[PDB]
């Protein structure tokens, strides 16, 4: 009747991560969240990843 909605995401890794505010030399400025070894949705060539 109420409609309570929950969102569960199981995980058992707990790898370190960080945020990256990248600015392209052309002028485009965006942000993305890289993971420890996982690609971060490469934005036109740049595939900077984070290591732990």
């Amino acid at each position: 009747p109420h409609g309570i909605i929950w969102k569960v995401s199981p995980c058992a890794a707990w790898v370190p991560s960080a945020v990256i505010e990248l600015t392209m030399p052309s002028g485009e400025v965006r942000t993305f969240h890289p993971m420890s070894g996982i690609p971060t949705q490469v934005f036109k060539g740049v595939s900077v990843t984070y290591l732990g």
Binding site: S26, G27, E28, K44, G45
Partner: protein, 51 residues
């Protein structure tokens, strides 16, 4: 290469099987984009195919 004569085309009514569309392509309404994005996409495309 050339258009040779055909007796079947004299009636003036040709069936639909005589029309061929090279490749499967569909169109849709588009939205104008700035020149910077198109230039970056062209650069990435020409970098994806160095051969």
């Amino acid at each position: 290469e050339l258009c040779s004569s055909d007796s079947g085309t004299s009636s003036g009514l040709l069936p639909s099987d005589r029309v061929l569309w090279i490749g499967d392509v569909a169109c849709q309404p588009m939205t104008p984009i700035p020149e910077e994005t198109f230039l970056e996409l062209k650069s990435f495309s020409q970098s994806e195919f160095p051969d």
